[PDB]
Amino acid sequence: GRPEWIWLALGTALMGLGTLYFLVKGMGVSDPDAKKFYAITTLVPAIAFTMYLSMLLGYGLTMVPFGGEQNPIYWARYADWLFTTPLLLLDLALLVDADQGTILALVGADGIMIGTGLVGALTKVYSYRFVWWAISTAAMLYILYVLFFGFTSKAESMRPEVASTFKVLRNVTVVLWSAYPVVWLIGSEGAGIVPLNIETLLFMVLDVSAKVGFGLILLRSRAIFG
Numbered sequence: 293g294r295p296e297w298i299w300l301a302l303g304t305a306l307m308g309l310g311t312l313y314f315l316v317k318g319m320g321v322s323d324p325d326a327k328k329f330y331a332i333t334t335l336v337p338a339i340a341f342t343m344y345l346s347m348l349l350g351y352g353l354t355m356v357p358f359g360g361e362q363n364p365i366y367w368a369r370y371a372d373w374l375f376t377t378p379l380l381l382l383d384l385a386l387l388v389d390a391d392q393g394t395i396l397a398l399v400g401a402d403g404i405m406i407g408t409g410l411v412g413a414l415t416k417v418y419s420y421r422f423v424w425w426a427i428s429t430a431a432m433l434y435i436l437y438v439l440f441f442g443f444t445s446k447a448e449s450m451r452p453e454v455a456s457t458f459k460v461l462r463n464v465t466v467v468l469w470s471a472y473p474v475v476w477l478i479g480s481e482g483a484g485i486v487p488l489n490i491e492t493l494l495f496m497v498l499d500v501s502a503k504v505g506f507g508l509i510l511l512r513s514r515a516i517f518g
């Protein structure tokens with residue numbers, strides 16, 4: 293009875309339902325281009341379902357000493373994000389036909405974001421937790437910069453309906469993603485202001501929006517068809 297359990301349970305349910313809905317729709321499509329978007333986009337909440345379920349059952353949680361106390365850190369979030377965040381970037385890349393080398397650079401940056409975020413989360417010297425946070429946030433900002441300036445440029449060579457879908461998904465991504473570093477800084481991993489139960493609520497809202505919300509928008513569009 294960690295009080296955050298309720299949001300881990302709701303997160304589990306929403307990621308599950310979203311995965312099932314997307315699989316059902318995905319299995320029914322025959323267009324090859326649309327299939328690739330369905331495969332990527334169904335896997336996103338499926339992974340998140342597995343990690344939410346794991347946390348709900350008490351796995352992916354460790355205690356890290358800093359600031360003179362033992363602090364609960366959910367590390368399973370990073371195992372989700374490691375794979376889900378680049379898959380979302382891959383959906384955006386495929387929509388705008390990004391260059392292969394831009395994709396690699398973004399996936400690289402994304403692994404740096406998640407891996408330095410996790411190192412920060414497990415670091416025992418309080419000050420140095422923020423150093424890793426800042427490196428992670430830099431990597432995130434590079435990603436957003438590229439999505440905002442580079443991908444929008446590529447998108448403008450596409451038909452308007454593809455460009456328009458990309459722009460909504462870009463906007464969703466920039467708003468949601470930019471919130472994660474702030475939650476971490478003020479929550480249990482950082483300054484310890486916002487209690488773990490509220491923090492789990494906030495990451496559940498963000499996660500569901502960034503995966504299922506995003507997917508609803510992408511998979512209902514005409515832009516994914518060939």
Ligand SMILES: CCCCCCCCCCCCCCCC
Pocket residue numbers: 433434436437440466
């Ligand atoms: C040659 C121009 C280089 C531009 C340098 C920008 C550095 C700071 C970027 C901070 C990220 C902003 C993200 C924008 C996303 C909406």
Ligand SMILES: CCCCCCCCCCCC
Pocket residue numbers: 298301302305
């Ligand atoms: C206590 C919170 C968990 C709620 C679980 C709901 C499970 C799926 C509901 C299906 C209804 C559409």
Ligand SMILES: CCCCCCCCCCCC
Pocket residue numbers: 311315331332334335338
């Ligand atoms: C219920 C779990 C579903 C996850 C399916 C997504 C994976 C797509 C693989 C690509 C098909 C060859």
Ligand SMILES: CCCCCCCCCCCC
Pocket residue numbers: 393396397398400401404427430431434
């Ligand atoms: C083709 C490029 C491969 C890896 C690129 C990494 C991009 C910069 C990350 C900034 C982190 C602070």
Ligand SMILES: CCCCCCCCCCCC
Pocket residue numbers: 426
């Ligand atoms: C007392 C020591 C000063 C601490 C330095 C803080 C620097 C903030 C820079 C943030 C980089 C993104």
Ligand SMILES: CCCCCCCCCCCC
Pocket residue numbers: none
């Ligand atoms: C002891 C004085 C240290 C003050 C450092 C402040 C400058 C932070 C630089 C961050 C640049 C990104």
Ligand SMILES: CCCCCCCCCCCC
Pocket residue numbers: 485
């Ligand atoms: C609209 C944002 C409201 C921010 C709430 C501030 C949290 C203050 C905590 C006081 C510590 C006991």
Ligand SMILES: CCCCCCCCCCCC
Pocket residue numbers: 485486487490
């Ligand atoms: C035990 C909890 C005491 C502090 C309450 C602060 C709540 C912060 C929520 C801010 C939302 C952004």
Ligand SMILES: CCCCCCCCCC
Pocket residue numbers: 301302304305
């Ligand atoms: C004590 C109440 C236990 C109920 C657990 C419900 C979680 C279900 C996830 C769908």
Ligand SMILES: CCCCCCCCCC
Pocket residue numbers: 308311312338341342345346
């Ligand atoms: C929603 C589709 C089912 C995903 C199966 C994976 C379950 C592993 C949880 C530990």
Ligand SMILES: CCCCCCCCCC
Pocket residue numbers: 423427
């Ligand atoms: C007190 C330690 C500060 C050193 C942090 C330097 C990190 C820059 C790497 C990108």
Ligand SMILES: CCCCCCCCCC
Pocket residue numbers: 490493494497
């Ligand atoms: C301490 C109670 C205040 C927290 C409310 C947080 C609202 C988040 C909704 C997305």
Ligand SMILES: CCCCCCCCC
Pocket residue numbers: 420423427
């Ligand atoms: C990915 C770059 C690693 C830089 C490490 C700085 C941490 C020193 C406390």
